[PDB]
Amino acid sequence: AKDGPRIIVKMESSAGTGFYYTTTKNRRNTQAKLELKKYDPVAKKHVVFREKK
Amino acid sequence: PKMKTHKMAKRRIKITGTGKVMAFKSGKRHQNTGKSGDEIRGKGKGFVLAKAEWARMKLMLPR
Amino acid sequence: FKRPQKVQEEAATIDVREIDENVTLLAADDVAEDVRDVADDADYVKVLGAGQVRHELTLIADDFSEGAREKVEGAGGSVELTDL
Amino acid sequence: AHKKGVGSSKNGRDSNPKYLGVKKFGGEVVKAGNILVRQRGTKFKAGQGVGMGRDHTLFALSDGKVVFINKGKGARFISIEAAQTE
RNA sequence: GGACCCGGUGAAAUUGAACUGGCCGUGAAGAUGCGGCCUACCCGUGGCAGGACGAAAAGACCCCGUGGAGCUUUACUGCAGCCUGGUGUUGGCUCUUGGUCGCGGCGCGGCUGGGGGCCUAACCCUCGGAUGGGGGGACAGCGCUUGGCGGGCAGUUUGACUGGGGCGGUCGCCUCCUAAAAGGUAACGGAGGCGCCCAAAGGUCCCCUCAGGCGGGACGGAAAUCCGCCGGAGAGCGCAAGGGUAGAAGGGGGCCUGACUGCGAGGCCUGCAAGCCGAGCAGGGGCGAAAGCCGGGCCUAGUGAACCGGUGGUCCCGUGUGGAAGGGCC
RNA sequence: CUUGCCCGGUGCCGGAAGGUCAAGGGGAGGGGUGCAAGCCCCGAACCGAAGCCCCGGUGAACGGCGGCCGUAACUAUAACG
RNA sequence: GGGGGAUGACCCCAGGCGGUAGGGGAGCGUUCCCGAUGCCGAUGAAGGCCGACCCGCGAGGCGGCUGGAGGUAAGGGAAGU
RNA sequence: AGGUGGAGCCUGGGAGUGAGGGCGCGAGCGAUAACGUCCGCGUCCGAGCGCGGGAACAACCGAGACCGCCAGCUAAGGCCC
RNA sequence: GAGCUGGGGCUAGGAGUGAAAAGCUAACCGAGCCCGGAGAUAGCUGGUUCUCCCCGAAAUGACUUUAGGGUCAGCCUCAGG
RNA sequence: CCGCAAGGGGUUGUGGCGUGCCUAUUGAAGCAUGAGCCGGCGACUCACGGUCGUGGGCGAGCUUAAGCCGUUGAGGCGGAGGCGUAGGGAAACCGAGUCCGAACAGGGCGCAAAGUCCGCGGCCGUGGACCCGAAACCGG
RNA sequence: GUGGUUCGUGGAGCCAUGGGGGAAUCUGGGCGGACCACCGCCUAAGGCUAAGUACUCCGGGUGACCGAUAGCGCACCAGU
RNA sequence: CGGGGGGAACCUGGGGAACUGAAACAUCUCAGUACCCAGAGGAGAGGAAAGAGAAAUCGACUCCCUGAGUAGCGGCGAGCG
């Protein structure tokens, strides 16, 4: 998107490998290297999910 | 002799015996659009009427 | 979505009832115990289901759909081209 | 390379609110009453409003849809006599 | 000296046509021809300029055609020429320092880089009286690629609005008012906000009852902090307005992330594409005992076609078959 | 008769030690196919040109060469500040 | 449009009918190619000159005068109308 | 419901203008100024919505122009010349 | 006398010449003239033919280097259901 | 004056009601332009495609180029092809079913209604292509 | 570094070449589109070669081709 | 002994462009066209394959139909094809 080194930075998150990812917008603003949550890659379902990229 | 914006004929295009023609959804996606998900579920195929006449025609013949 | 040149392969459109019928007029040849393979309308034999196999006949061709080949078994045979 | 002031001059753009289907017509599982999208439809007609009483829409199917506060979300069912045994 | 009267000769632009008066009114708003009226016989020649919007010329002043042509510079690009690295027919002899890898070091070693020298057989020039001498000489001319300057020139371009062109403004999108009460409409008509953001204003489960005013006491004399009364919520909600609306969106705490994939019956607005809504179906969770809610936010702004490409996934295509460059799909 | 003041930008003249950077040399390393010797590319650390950056000189080279408040001034810049 | 049309036509009444871009239907003469078991004219081809029969019409026919040689197609076709 | 009667709906070929004004009314601007412009509701004109009227005057009041010269009632508007 | 001149020639027209205004280059060179691209393009301008029948337009809205163009809609017309 | 006689010819004295004609125009008599007068030239065409409508030959319909036959010269053979015969999909491929997907929720289609060639037309593209109109660029 | 090719710098080959390096003589040497293995094709870096298609100054034939402002502009002391 | 000079049109080589379309215009198009040059002929052009493609299939060159407005080239736009 409109890449603006302004606390506005786009990122994703793997599925422990579940394989690929899924969309997400972000803001250093707070918690830098902070970013985790679960989902479900083509890999079965669910799976921890770091976001960092 | 004749041809056709072969183009559009390429991208978006192609008719059904019905005498009608369609090209893939075409909301936003595939450019800018961190946007959302469910919105994703927003790309199948969009069939515009009226104009699809220039189209079809201009293509006419092979497609 | 198009290519950088040509390439391509093949295959055709030949189907059920289609035959049985217009092939009913195909009886002017191998339309007895029927060794099909016309030679009249199309190019690269394929067999479309729909309809209801019949005229009990073995067909020397490429292939066909599910049911078809099935129905086939209804009352006939099925031979494939070159090697299969 | 900028813009000026002391020229207020600032036209406004377009909307498109309505009551679509108004009150008491052939009811079709589709956009009920409208004046606030994202809306959250309801059940049958609606009668709650910054007015007092209520409104029936002698039209019944799945459901309709609200407008966020205005009108008055549905809930006071009302399938309509035209919802009995065939 | 023409002009005027005679005799001889004898054109020329413009012109629908016409036997063509003044008035005061009128019409598209400065009329012999339309209305009312007043003067009004038919023709001519010598004249005098006012009107026939007289003649000349499809305004040169104007704007409009994403017309043209000339000059200008830190307009765009490109060429001419000029500077420039390596390379070539541009051969010898010696003086030298640098790198490097191997066996701060030094010894060696292949490697290879810089450079200084008369020479000289190309090359060129030189001539000066012949083809020999002389001078420069590895130059350079000059060929090929590099790069650079480069208006010298060549070709295009330099928006719209605009109650005359320009200067001035201004163009998207959110709200009010304008819209006469369905919807919806100009105005360079009024006023005001937006090209953010919030990982926790997210999802639920559990609790709260606002501003304010009055009365009573610490640090306090506006303006807290607590205690006791009054309250169609006038506070409250990240941001502009407007609707909302405590029952609460609104104020806390508990775990939780569905701020989901596959989809969506069926509608709103709509020439286009968009834009926007949504039960319910399946997989898989979260919150509650559960009946249920969860597919981000209280909303309506926080925006962009399709192509031009990156990248993580596919293992669909793979141009004799085995593959990969490369391509399609996410 | 007499041509004064400014080289911060610009053109230019000089400098070339240092940054940069093209073609290029020149090797780490990866890649495809390869039974294997091989056989093609991507290749980068460093060396590397003018130019540009940086130092200076440059005006019968382009070009430019200040503002307001106070003060003897019975009144006005001014001699000064 | 509708009431019976024998091919015409005839009767009712409904029912209008002003119209530029512009849309639909129907007709007219112009020079040619048929000669769909077609040919007129020296007592005039045709054009011309003039007219109080035929048609809503664009045209027809037909009669009088002129003038030296052609061409007409009862029907369909074509186009430098 | 429908007295109506003749508009309606879909598919499809062929289009034109893509800038108008004038009047009444309700608003905007504007000196509530203009044959000013700007949006709306109806009409109006469209180079023929050709005729009557208001002298004359598209245009405002009445009127819908198939055709019939020596008929008849009226409209609006008029009837001393 | 950077004097006027005849005769002989040289340069040339995107190029010449020019004691230099854009002057002069076979009587209008801000880039000659003839033939050729070629009947260049030309939202602009005109110009746009025989009769007759039938109905009957818009001068708004949406996006445009688009505003005196034109796309799509809206209002026309004919064929069938 | 009555070669179409009791009806008309021609000319007008009066009176009676009357703004020419073309383009572009909100609107025009025009004082806006167009034209002095007469005669002849002079402007929606042809081709290949495609496109609907219609006249008709077979429904699988239809013909290139050529070979032969040719007062008149007489057409007749030629079966590469191409549109229809399912389509759905980026594709693999499947197939009256298919793509998204892991789900029976929708998109395209099935359902024959079948064309196809030709003729003649209203049109659409390439064409100088409704007709003339300029300033300019480029070659010799 | 250009060409031609449908290829407009592209995953981009073949053939043709502007500059510089400068191989092989049959297990040789290009090719089948980057490349590589294997298969399959072909044998260059000299030359000649009628016939099948194109064009009308010329001569003929034929015309739903014209008729003196049409046809070539010019039907006859016209490119004068 | 041959040439050279011609010659409407046609032929290959040598060299070789803007308009205009893309509703600007730099890519692109018109095109390898128009023009100029050289030269062969009555015809030149070309012509027994380090070819084509892939069914282990085809074979000179040329030309007509077809392949095909397809495979495909591209500010994937106008077009070229």
mmCIF file of C-alpha atoms (C1' of nucleotides) in Angstrom, chain I residues 15-80:
data_model
loop_
_atom_site.group_PDB
_atom_site.id
_atom_site.type_symbol
_atom_site.label_atom_id
_atom_site.label_comp_id
_atom_site.label_asym_id
_atom_site.label_seq_id
_atom_site.Cartn_x
_atom_site.Cartn_y
_atom_site.Cartn_z
ATOM 1 C "C1'" A I 15 20.335 27.312 -46.627
ATOM 2 C "C1'" G I 16 22.358 31.928 -48.568
ATOM 3 C "C1'" U I 17 23.566 36.696 -47.828
ATOM 4 C "C1'" G I 18 22.854 40.754 -44.557
ATOM 5 C "C1'" A I 19 27.579 48.443 -42.362
ATOM 6 C "C1'" A I 20 21.599 43.530 -39.642
ATOM 7 C "C1'" A I 21 14.805 45.867 -39.249
ATOM 8 C "C1'" A I 22 14.153 39.484 -39.501
ATOM 9 C "C1'" G I 23 15.799 42.864 -43.906
ATOM 10 C "C1'" C I 24 16.438 40.613 -49.595
ATOM 11 C "C1'" U I 25 16.706 36.467 -52.008
ATOM 12 C "C1'" A I 26 12.369 37.026 -59.967
ATOM 13 C "C1'" A I 27 7.236 42.465 -57.392
ATOM 14 C "C1'" C I 28 3.297 39.741 -50.148
ATOM 15 C "C1'" C I 29 10.420 34.661 -47.984
ATOM 16 C "C1'" G I 30 9.421 35.158 -39.702
ATOM 17 C "C1'" A I 31 11.950 30.292 -43.306
ATOM 18 C "C1'" G I 32 11.723 30.913 -51.397
ATOM 19 C "C1'" C I 33 9.193 28.345 -55.840
ATOM 20 C "C1'" C I 34 7.453 24.034 -59.009
ATOM 21 C "C1'" C I 35 6.310 18.825 -59.215
ATOM 22 C "C1'" G I 36 5.747 14.627 -55.218
ATOM 23 C "C1'" G I 37 3.751 12.588 -49.784
ATOM 24 C "C1'" A I 38 -1.731 13.668 -51.097
ATOM 25 C "C1'" G I 39 -7.809 14.097 -52.392
ATOM 26 C "C1'" A I 40 -2.366 15.219 -45.412
ATOM 27 C "C1'" U I 41 -5.550 15.965 -40.772
ATOM 28 C "C1'" A I 42 -9.379 20.063 -40.459
ATOM 29 C "C1'" G I 43 -14.750 18.922 -32.716
ATOM 30 C "C1'" C I 44 -14.794 24.718 -37.067
ATOM 31 C "C1'" U I 45 -17.276 26.871 -41.736
ATOM 32 C "C1'" G I 46 -20.361 26.374 -45.612
ATOM 33 C "C1'" G I 47 -22.626 23.180 -49.113
ATOM 34 C "C1'" U I 48 -26.207 18.632 -48.694
ATOM 35 C "C1'" U I 49 -30.843 17.129 -54.324
ATOM 36 C "C1'" C I 50 -38.104 14.426 -56.946
ATOM 37 C "C1'" U I 51 -43.186 13.663 -54.658
ATOM 38 C "C1'" C I 52 -46.125 11.818 -50.550
ATOM 39 C "C1'" C I 53 -47.994 8.999 -46.076
ATOM 40 C "C1'" C I 54 -47.606 7.841 -40.523
ATOM 41 C "C1'" C I 55 -46.065 9.264 -35.651
ATOM 42 C "C1'" G I 56 -43.361 12.326 -33.267
ATOM 43 C "C1'" A I 57 -37.730 14.823 -30.490
ATOM 44 C "C1'" A I 58 -33.872 17.149 -26.840
ATOM 45 C "C1'" A I 59 -31.440 21.959 -25.645
ATOM 46 C "C1'" U I 60 -31.028 17.430 -18.684
ATOM 47 C "C1'" G I 61 -27.871 13.819 -15.882
ATOM 48 C "C1'" A I 62 -23.153 10.984 -15.123
ATOM 49 C "C1'" C I 63 -17.257 10.848 -16.576
ATOM 50 C "C1'" U I 64 -13.789 13.219 -19.502
ATOM 51 C "C1'" U I 65 -6.071 18.075 -21.410
ATOM 52 C "C1'" U I 66 -13.906 17.015 -21.504
ATOM 53 C "C1'" A I 67 -16.446 21.451 -22.032
ATOM 54 C "C1'" G I 68 -19.639 25.155 -29.076
ATOM 55 C "C1'" G I 69 -17.083 17.645 -29.011
ATOM 56 C "C1'" G I 70 -18.590 12.780 -27.383
ATOM 57 C "C1'" U I 71 -19.329 7.854 -24.295
ATOM 58 C "C1'" C I 72 -23.731 5.774 -21.186
ATOM 59 C "C1'" A I 73 -28.466 7.003 -19.519
ATOM 60 C "C1'" G I 74 -33.145 9.829 -20.388
ATOM 61 C "C1'" C I 75 -36.844 11.499 -24.160
ATOM 62 C "C1'" C I 76 -37.922 8.989 -31.058
ATOM 63 C "C1'" U I 77 -39.013 5.198 -34.554
ATOM 64 C "C1'" C I 78 -40.044 0.381 -36.960
ATOM 65 C "C1'" A I 79 -40.331 -5.788 -36.304
ATOM 66 C "C1'" G I 80 -42.286 -9.667 -33.168
#
